[PDB]
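F.,

This is the one I mentioned.
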């Protein structure tokens, strides 16, 4: 019922995610272990199955390891049936232990368990107030060789046990046949194969229907979240259409993808994805920077806040960024032979910072290992006594109890090369966090100011990371203190809120009729009003209303970005959740093709149209730069776009380059979209 409930599938910023590589966590059932060349009994080959399964996860929930840590969500390997063949990559036998080589998206990987096992995991987690997130990888099936049907399992796709097709002799046209990508461009990485993985053709409506059917199965079993694999390698438009159908369905859930960024790197396409796909993202800008600051010491605390400020400017849904200090695709945070304070401080920052914190299994056991697959070693121990375990145990529950932590703004109160003091603020609640990364020097903190009410505040960590108590004056001035070497402390104030405050709205995108979840404080007990822009939602439009959460039906309002606000029963107004994307209606994915659109170097073709999904005639929101190498060749251009179903579209193409915009001549192109199917529309550039 409240915002913090395990029942809240759609919003995760009050949660702490624990990321499990299922095969490498705990073998709770040896009877489902693979055997022979596919299994590593002595764990000498990290590319074979070790035997970790869902029973193992269930066991660590029941025996208190996970629950005692204070984690409230598990993010697990893709649960679906994978290939069972052993593949000799680079002189070494490899398996599907990682779950990414699907063969049937409607069946389980029997190494992990059967469907009853999976239901048991869902129910056991939910009973313990833990949400479950699954990897889902609709980009591809499994390895295939163009010139050898006998390689691996030839990327074969089954549908509840019956053959849909394989990569060789792909008679139903389920796969792309453009070779492998060189990752040179996003287009190249989308419509060519990811390494040798048979690449799903989502412009084939058989595949659109198949994957919508598949995900509904898993959501019907009670899955609370989806982590999409390889979002950079599928069309933006197909994924936007895909998640909109989830949001319009019976089980809206939290979704996020992995779009990798290196250290010191920003990517505009990454930002557009997170802001406009309807899907959120792992926060690699955060992750890489925190590693630079604490692990490698290659950036200062001043650099750190600069990144926090810039992400704030870049991303529209800041409370949805999934933060972390490492994961399955990075070198382990802990460097072997190094101290543990770096880990403990990085964890404390992540747990108290904006977004959705995710912790990679074994981080709290200081597990080491550089590169794949060394970063995916078996869980080394279940010792509940490590400092890192205790850090998580102390801080993770604050995400549930202190709305400033879960939802609040972020403010810099103090900075030095080695010292950062951050303040979170939401309504009357606040949290103040101080970190000194220097293990050899303490720092006097003088003249520090805070939004904390006057009083004495003890460290939530109780000095575990050498923190201290503080005294706050009636003007907000913090009495001078010394922040100890390696110091980390958290001071907090939680108040009863009298004025309505919106902390998050999920999903961030929806067509009229979708049910959205509005989380926060001070909504009151009796139903008030919800607003999309100035459009009122009342009575039957209100699904439910309590003080920390409202569920509302998206009204028939004009499509486009708008602000969501509320008004209590006594007429008190709230803040606004900005940039909610109202869709025109149910979506389909449409491939747009334009022919004979020649351009000069530096000029690209874009798509614009009257629908909001087509940028509403705004050349600055034109869709593109369009693609012109793989699916179709220059001077033809193409793009796959999420557009309203059963709807007449008016559109034109434009050429943009060097600050000048040239529009197509003649009248608008017109096209009425399919009612439910993906489709293709092909037109000629009008001179
Ligand atoms: Ca097992
Ligand atoms: Ca692809």
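My design for it:
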């Amino acid at each position: 019922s409240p915002d913090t409930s395990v029942d809240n599938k759609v919003n995760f910023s009050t949660d702490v995610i624990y990321q499990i590589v299922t095969d490498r966590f705990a073998d709770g059932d040896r009877t489902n272990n693979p055997a022979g060349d596919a299994f590593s009994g002595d764990r000498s080959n990290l590319k074979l199955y070790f035997g970790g399964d869902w029973q193992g996860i269930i066991d660590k929930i029941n025996d208190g390891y996970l629950t005692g840590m204070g984690v409230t969500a598990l993010w697990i390997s893709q649960p679906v049936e994978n290939i069972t063949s052993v593949i000799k990559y680079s002189g070494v036998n490899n398996t599907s232990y990682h779950g990414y080589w699907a063969r049937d998206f409607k069946q389980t990987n029997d190494a992990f368990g059967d469907f009853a096992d999976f239901q048991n995991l869902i129910d056991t987690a939910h009973a313990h107030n833990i949400k479950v997130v699954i990897d889902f990888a609709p980009n591809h099936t499994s390895p295939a060789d163009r010139d050898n049907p006998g390689f691996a399992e030839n990327g074969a796709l089954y549908d509840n046990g019956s053959l849909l097709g394989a990569h060789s002799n792909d008679t139903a046209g389920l796969f792309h046949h453009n070779g492998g990508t060189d990752f040179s461009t996003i287009e190249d990485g989308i419509y060519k194969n990811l390494y040798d993985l048979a690449d799903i053709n989502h412009n084939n409506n058989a595949m659109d229907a198949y994957f919508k059917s598949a995900i509904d199965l898993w959501l019907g079993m009670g899955v609370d979240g989806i982590r999409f694999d390889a979002v950079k390698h599928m069309p933006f438009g197909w994924q936007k259409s895909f998640v909109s159908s989830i949001y319009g369905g019976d089980h809206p859930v939290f979704t996020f993808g992995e779009w990798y960024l290196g250290a010191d790197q920003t990517d505009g396409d990454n930002i557009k994805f997170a802001n406009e796909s309807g899907m959120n993202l792992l926060d690699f800008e955060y992750a890489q920077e925190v590693r630079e600051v604490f692990r490698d010491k290659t950036e200062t605390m001043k650099d750190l806040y600069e990144v926090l400020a810039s992400t704030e400017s870049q991303y529209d849904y800041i409370n949805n960024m999934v933060t972390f200090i490492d994961n399955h695709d990075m070198d382990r945070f802990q460097v072997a032979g190094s101290g543990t304070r770096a880990t403990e401080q990085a964890l404390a920052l992540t747990l108290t910072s904006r977004g959705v914190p995710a912790i990679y299994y074994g981080t709290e056991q200081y597990m080491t290992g550089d590169g794949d697959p060394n970063n995916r070693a078996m869980m080394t121990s279940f010792n509940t006594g490590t400092t890192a375990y205790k850090v998580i145990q102390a801080l993770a529950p604050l995400r549930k109890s202190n709305p400033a932590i879960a939802y609040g703004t972020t403010t810099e109160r103090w900075v030095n090369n080695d010292v950062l003091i951050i303040e979170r603020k939401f309504g009357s609640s606040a949290a103040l966090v101080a970190i000194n990364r220097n293990s050899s020097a303490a720092y006097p903190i003088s003249g520090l100011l805070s939004s904390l009410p006057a009083g004495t505040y003890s460290d939530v960590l109780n000095g575990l990371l050498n923190g201290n108590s503080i005294t706050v004056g009636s003007g907000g001035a913090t009495t001078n203190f010394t922040l100890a070497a390696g110091g980390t402390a958290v001071w907090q104030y939680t108040a009863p809120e009298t004025s309505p405050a919106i902390g998050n709205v999920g999903p961030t995108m929806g067509q009229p009729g979708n049910i959205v979840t509005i989380d926060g404080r001070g909504f009151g007990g009796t139903a008030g009003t919800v607003y999309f822009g100035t459009t009122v939602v009342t009575g039957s439009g209100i699904v439910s209303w309590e003080d920390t959460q409202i569920k509302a039906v998206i009204p028939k309002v004009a499509a486009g970005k708008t602000g969501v606000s509320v008004k209590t029963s006594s007429g008190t107004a709230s803040n606004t959740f900005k940039s909610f994307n109202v869709l025109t209606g149910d979506q389909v994915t449409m491939r747009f093709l334009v022919n004979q659109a020649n351009t000069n170097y530096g000029t690209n073709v874009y798509l614009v149209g009257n629908a909001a999904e087509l940028g509403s005639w705004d050349p600055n929101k034109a869709i593109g730069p369009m693609y012109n190498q793989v699916i179709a060749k220059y001077p033809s251009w193409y793009y796959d776009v999420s557009v309203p179903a059963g709807t007449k579209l008016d559109f034109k193409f434009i050429k943009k380059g060097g600050g000048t915009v040239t529009w197509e001549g003649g009248g608008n192109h017109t096209y009425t979209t399919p009612a439910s199917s993906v489709g293709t529309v092909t037109v000629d550039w009008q001179n």
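The two ends are 58 Å apart (CA to CA).

Talk soon.
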